[PDB]
Write a protein that binds this DNA or RNA. Structure first.
Ligand SMILES: Nc1ccn([C@H]2C[C@H](O)[C@@H](COP(=O)(O)NP(=O)(O)OP(=O)(O)O)O2)c(=O)n1
Ligand SMILES: [Mg+2]
Ligand SMILES: [Mg+2]
Ligand code: NA
Ligand code: NA
Length: 326
DNA sequence: CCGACGCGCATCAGC
DNA sequence: GCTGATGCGT
DNA sequence: GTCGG
């Protein structure tokens, strides 16, 4: 973190554009700039030096010059003193409350944690759980706990069907010493791109993890994606562990490599890679990589037999998960 | 300049 | 009920 | 907000 002050500033600006301005491309613009600067191996001396990096333009270079000269940004200082922006930015920190709902709540005079807690009936299910564990979801998960959780999930899954394979992805697979949550990729030979020979494949796993009281809440749940809450068990007289967010994604067995590429991330790495794929005349999702016709219509799925194959198609040198943290 | 910026589940409007 | 748009999230 | 065409 040679440029922590700068990347913090850009992230706060990114969050402003997302939550208050509702300008998603500015949000992405700032986050991209923050990302490229984060991995720049020099302590930045000026905006001109930063402007040389892909993603940093004139407006951000000027902000970096202001920040380096004064240690702050007047634009951010103003935003911080604005009541509406500060209220909206706070509310969106609750999972399930986005920019639209946040602004709506503020209009109705619901703008503090305390307001939320007396108006539970005005929240949808996702939001109510987001409020419930607002404090816990703020906390990061030490990798040591991630390993305990991996152990539980992987063996409970084995107990349901020995042919399930569960892979912990996200920041954990990228080797992070702490994670924001747990991300699990799930496969079963009964579910392929060709057919689904068995119903309830995801359900039965969720069910089992609920039975052993690992999963405690459900934010959303469909045939292929589960979004919920989990908690490690604690020993006698021990204070309980924080409740954690857990995502489970069932992916067709034969499309594992596209799936694990997707779910390993990071989110910005995926955006950059998929954008690059477009420039190279391909499109990538969690299932396949497809060529683009001159028309701009996707073709048939190309053969993929490793994560590296996907990198090869778009003429990228392979990058291990630990080097995908952008 | 200026177009473009990488899919699952919950909810709602419209029919 | 189904279809498509929107919100929110991964 | 930034970039390639
Ligand atoms: N916008 C997004 C958000 C997530 N994802 C994918 C890539 C992520 O690594 C994976 C899990 O999302 P995540 O849990 O929000 N982030 P990730 O695990 O990388 O870091 P943490 O904050 O969880 O430690 O989903 C994506 O492709 N685009
Ligand atoms: Mg994660
Ligand atoms: Mg997650
Ligand atoms: Na630049
Ligand atoms: Na939120």
């Amino acid at each position: 973190t040679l440029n922590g002050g700068i990347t913090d500033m850009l992230t706060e600006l990114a969050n402003f554009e997302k939550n208050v301005s509702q300008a998603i491309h500015k949000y992405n613009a700032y986050r991209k700039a923050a990302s490229v600067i984060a991995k720049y191996p020099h302590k930045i001396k000026s905006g001109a030096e930063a402007k040389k990096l892909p993603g940093v333009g004139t407006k951000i270079a000027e902000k970096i010059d202001e920040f380096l000269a004064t240690g702050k940004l007047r634009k951010l200082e103003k935003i911080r003193q604005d009541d509406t922006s500060s209220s909206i930015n706070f509310l969106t920190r609750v999972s399930g409350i986005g920019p639209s709902a946040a602004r709506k709540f503020v209009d109705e005079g619901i703008k503090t944690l305390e307001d939320l807690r007396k108006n539970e009936d005005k929240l949808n299910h996702h939001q109510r759980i987001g409020l419930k564990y607002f404090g816990d979801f703020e906390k990061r998960i030490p990798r040591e706990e991630m390993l305990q959780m991996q152990d539980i999930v992987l063996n409970e899954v084995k107990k349901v069907d020995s042919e399930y394979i569960a892979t912990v992805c996200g920041s954990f697979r990228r080797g992070a010493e702490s994670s924001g949550d747990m991300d699990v990729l799930l496969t079963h030979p009964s579910f392929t791109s060709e057919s689904t020979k068995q119903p309830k494949l995801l359900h039965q796993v969720v069910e089992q993890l609920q039975k052993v009281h690992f999963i405690t809440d459900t934010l959303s749940k469909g045939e292929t994606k589960f979004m919920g809450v989990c908690q490690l068990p604690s020993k006698n007289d021990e204070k309980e562990y924080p409740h954690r967010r857990i995502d489970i994604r069932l992916i067709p067995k034969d499309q594992y490599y596209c799936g694990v590429l997707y779910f390993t991330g990071s989110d910005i790495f995926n955006k950059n890679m998929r954008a690059h794929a477009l420039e190279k005349g391909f499109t990538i999702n969690e299932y396949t990589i497809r060529p683009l016709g001159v028309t701009g219509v996707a073709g048939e799925p190309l053969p993929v037999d490793s994560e590296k194959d996907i990198f090869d198609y778009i003429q990228w040198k392979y990058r291990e998960p630990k080097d995908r943290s952008e």
